[PDB]
Design a protein around this ligand. Structure first.
Ligand SMILES: CCNC(=O)[C@H](C)[C@@H]1N=C(c2ccc(Cl)cc2)c2ccc(OC)cc2-n2c(C)nnc21
Ligand SMILES: C[C@H](O)COC[C@H](C)O
Ligand SMILES: [Cl-]
Length: 109
């Protein structure tokens, strides 16, 4: 990994850590639309994303730079904001996790 990608990996590890689990947990694995009963999810969300997918991509060296990584993390949040009403509990969780993400991403070397 490049130096900037190492910082990205550090952020990813933090997003997945116990420190943030109270609001990060919905983002750990791909949304299971059937399990959640949200039978319109894949009509609304054309490009699903979640932290396990970002992690696999990082491990496989799929991201060529920090910008590509950030676009995926942001896509994950955006999907949450697109599908759910803005007053929803899961949206509040997304906003909190995104605050953690954006502030640390801003500290990129
Ligand atoms: C109909 C209610 N809305 C949903 O079920 C969402 C599709 C779902 N809500 C939730 C959700 C709803 C309420 C609370 Cl307090 C936390 C998460 C959700 C739950 C589990 C999960 O993976 C295991 C992913 C979730 N998620 C993400 C991420 N983005 N949207 C959701
Ligand atoms: C809550 C907004 O959707 C994302 O805000 C990011 C800011 C760094 O908290
Ligand atoms: Cl972006």
């Amino acid at each position: 990994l490049s130096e900037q990608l190492k910082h990205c990996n550090g952020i990813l590890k933090e997003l997945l850590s116990k420190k943030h689990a109270a609001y990060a947990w919905p983002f750990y694995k791909p949304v299971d639309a059937s399990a959640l009963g949200v039978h319109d999810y894949h009509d609304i969300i054309k490009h699903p994303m979640d932290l396990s997918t970002v992690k696999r991509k990082m491990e496989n060296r799929d991201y060529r730079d920090a910008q590509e990584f950030a676009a995926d993390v942001r896509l994950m949040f955006s999907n949450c904001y697109k599908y759910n009403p803005p007053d929803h509990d899961v949206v509040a969780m997304a906003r909190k996790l995104q605050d953690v993400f954006e502030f640390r991403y801003a500290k990129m070397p």
